[PDB]
């Protein structure tokens with residue numbers, strides 16, 4: 001089975017550097033781009049950059065160009081991201097993943113806790129949290145600052161992250177259910193406006209949902225919507 005394995009936690013000091021690892025298995029490491037993603041409560045997910053492990057070629061989001069360095073070690077099938085000059089602003093969970101929807105695969109993420117006691121497309125989700133009773137409908141909006149469409153296809157996906165589990169693809173290209181996702185989920189929209197629907201909601205559906213566009217670089221994500229069950 002294909003896996004990306006990341007250590008759970010790194011507790012680190014301001015000003016230090018930390019090297020995060022992503023040990024891959026179950027597929028040819030050299031042949032698939034790997035991406036790294038930062039998660040925070042307020043900013044949702046941020047695309048850091050990506051590496052093609054076969055040759056080591058990298059691309060970085062301008063905002064992380066000095067903070068992150070991506071490398072790949074083909075002899076151990078492991079990708080690494082160094083974060084340098086740590087500050088409190090680096091405390092976050094960092095995932096490695098294959099982000100193209102057809103190869104969707106996520107590691108469980110490494111929590112990096114920096115501890116000292118002392119024209120990109122913007123995606124806006126609405127609401128950012130909601131509680132819905134069992135059996136009822138959850139509806140969540142994602143709006144982009146510019147169109148994410150090309151040739152009649154929307155380059156926008158939705159991701160779900162259930163509590164304690166890695167993120168996973170839920171809907172790709174606006175309206176397609178990923179394999180294995182239940183029929184109670186549905187997605188609509190085009191251009192700049194998209195909507196996720198879940199009905200009837202079940203307990204398993206409690207999760208954080210994120211939209212993402214990959215029409216233009218850098219790939220960007222919404223800030224996340226946390227759905228809970230409203231106990232009745």
Ligand SMILES: [Cl-]
Pocket residue numbers: 125126127128
């Ligand atoms: Cl809102």
Ligand SMILES: [Cl-]
Pocket residue numbers: 182183184185
């Ligand atoms: Cl269902």
Ligand code: NA
Pocket residue numbers: 024025026027028029076077
């Ligand atoms: Na391998």
Ligand code: NA
Pocket residue numbers: 102103
């Ligand atoms: Na596939």
